[PDB]
Every structure is written in structure tokens, then in C-alpha cells.
Write a structure and sequence with these properties.
It is classed as oxidoreductase. The protein is of the alpha+beta class and about 200 residues long. Helices cover about 30% and strands about 30% of the residues. Strand 7 (about 135) and strand 8 (about 145) form a beta hairpin. Bound molecules: the ligand CC(C)(C)OC(=O)c1ccc(-n2ncc(-n3ccnn3)c2O)nc1 and manganese (II) ion.
Length: about 200
């Protein structure tokens, strides 16, 4: 149940460490289905933003609705954030040509995004053999964390400067879906600069 998982794990883990992992998020059957839709969608990296209701993206929509379900039950308990929206789903295809991703902060200048959510959908992926490990350096901590892109794994972490992260090279094609949730106040201040946007 999303309620138990949100209050007994996600909320306390995020407030304590700012990095949270949920394994076996949707089950093998749904995971494979999402892989089929992602592969059929993508058949440097390739990026596509999915709203969830497009033809052939129905199970990606279920993934997004499941994430929303968890964040909903975290209402008002993730720090001081008021999460009132999110981006589309960044459905990314990462090439296995021995390329990694430089260390970066997702939201370094307050663009409204407060929580990064990544779902990994590569069945039987063995990071020990194929690479692609995510390395997060939580600010001010004496440790850093290597997160394997395990199949059906869901990852939460703060999007701001608290979590600089880099990705190690991979040697086989892989896919991940990222979604960012907004903070009401921050996202509002970021929208003021635009005429209409
Ligand atoms: C256009 C905007 C500004 C929204 O782009 C981002 O903010 C953004 C995009 C991508 C990533 N990350 N971070 C890790 C990975 N990655 C790579 C392989 N496996 N995971 C990855 O694509 N982070 C932030
Ligand atoms: Mn990132």
C-alpha cells in the first residue's frame, strides 16, 4: 500500500538522508510492459517527454500515477515543500558506448523542482557487468552512495544542490524514466519572469 510506504519509509528516509530507494515498485509483469512501450518509443542520448495518455504509453501513465500516489501521501511531510505538480515523464534512452554523465545538480538555481524521481526498467540488468551506476554525493556528508539501476527500482532524492550526482559509463543500451515534482512557492517565483509560460 502506498500509504504505509510513504509514511513509514519515504518521508522519514527523505528527511534524514535525502536519498530513498524503493525496490520492486510495480512488479515484473508491469515492468516488462513499460519496457516494451519505452523500446517501441525510441525504436548522446535520446529524450522524449510523455504525458501518460499517449497511444502505446498507457503503462508509462500507470507508472506516473503510482509515483503521484506516493507523493500524495507524503503531502506536507517532505521538508517544508508543498508539492502541487510535476513535469512530464522524461523517457530517456542511454547508449552503452562507454559514455558517462558529468557530475551535476538537477536544479541548481531554483527552477521549482524539489524531488527527482527515477524509474529503471532494464530487466536482468547486472550493474557489475554492464555499468551505469549512479553515484550521489549528498552535500556535507562524509559518504557518497552508488545506486545500481536495478530493474523495477524507484529512486527519490532532493533535486537541489544537496545531491550532486554522476553516472558511470555503460556498455549496453539502457532506459530510465525521470519525473520531477515542483514546489508550489519556488515554481511560482520561477514563473514570474516569463510573459506567458
Ligand atoms: C532539461 C532538464 C534541465 C530538465 O534536464 C535535467 O534537469 C536533467 C536531465 C537528466 C539528468 N540525469 N541525471 C542522471 C541521468 N542519467 C543518465 C543515465 N542514467 N541516468 C540523467 O539523464 N539530470 C537532470
Ligand atoms: Mn540528474
Amino acid at each position: 500500500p502506498a500509504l504505509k510506504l510513504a509514511l513509514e519509509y519515504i518521508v522519514p528516509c527523505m528527511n534524514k538522508h535525502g536519498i530513498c530507494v524503493v525496490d520492486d515498485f510495480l512488479g515484473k509483469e508491469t515492468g516488462q510492459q513499460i519496457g516494451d512501450e519505452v523500446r517501441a518509443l525510441h525504436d548522446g542520448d535520446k529524450i522524449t517527454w510523455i504525458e501518460g495518455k499517449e497511444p502505446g504509453c498507457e503503462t508509462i501513465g500507470l507508472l506516473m500515477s503510482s509515483m503521484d500516489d506516493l507523493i500524495r501521501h507524503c503531502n506536507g511531510k517532505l521538508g517544508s515543500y508543498k508539492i502541487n505538480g510535476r513535469t512530464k515523464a522524461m523517457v530517456a534512452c542511454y547508449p552503452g558506448n562507454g559514455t558517462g554523465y558529468v557530475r551535476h545538480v538537477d536544479n541548481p538555481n531554483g527552477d521549482g523542482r524539489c524531488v527527482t524521481c527515477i524509474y529503471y526498467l532494464n530487466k536482468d540488468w547486472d550493474a557489475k557487468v554492464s555499468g551505469g551506476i549512479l553515484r550521489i554525493f549528498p552535500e556535507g556528508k562524509a559518504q557518497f552512495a552508488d545506486i545500481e539501476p536495478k530493474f523495477d527500482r524507484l529512486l527519490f532524492f532532493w533535486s537541489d544542490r544537496r545531491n550532486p550526482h554522476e553516472v558511470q559509463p555503460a556498455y549496453a543500451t539502457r532506459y530510465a524514466i525521470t519525473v520531477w515534482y515542483f514546489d508550489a512557492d519556488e515554481r511560482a517565483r520561477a514563473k514570474v519572469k516569463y510573459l506567458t509560460g
